[PDB]
ubiquitin carboxyl-terminal hydrolase 15
Amino acid sequence: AADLDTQRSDIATLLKTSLRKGDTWYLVDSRWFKQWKKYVGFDSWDKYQMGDQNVYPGPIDNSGLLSLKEHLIDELDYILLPTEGWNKLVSWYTLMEGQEPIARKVVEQGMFVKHCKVEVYLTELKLCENGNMNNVVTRRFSKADTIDTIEKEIRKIFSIPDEKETRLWNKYMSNTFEPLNKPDSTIQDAGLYQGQVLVIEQKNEDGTWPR
């Protein structure tokens, strides 16, 4: 373990690391992190518990975040560190026995107009075939995925011969069918969000479309 001032300084810096598309960052439970902050005198006016065993964080413990509970909020329920920051905390404190790191990637976020952000939650789309809407299959996709990518995957999920031709629709406002006819739009470009229903359609043998 590096000394307390080194830990404070290194983590302070690493917290402010620039977001670059493709990088891996790690979640750290705010409960553990708040104890670490006290132990190392981070943002602390009287340093009263700095170096005090009563606030020694112990092995990194993300149990309280768990597959993630919903409505977790950055800088309230968890904090994020780049690879180097996570590695340092592991070497100083170890990771709690029987846990795995919670790693997430930086992706471009927004509709058309975008900037980087760690994708803590992938977008869950509800998927179904036009013939059989009650058979809904759920899957999580990144905001980076294009409509083209989504469609290829939905074909696999439903075992759709590479011969049969398909069209993708989304249910706008849970109501009207709207075409997903721009294959190179990303899912957020197309305005798709958590829980959105997507319906895949197959061209008939006779060359006509079911819809």
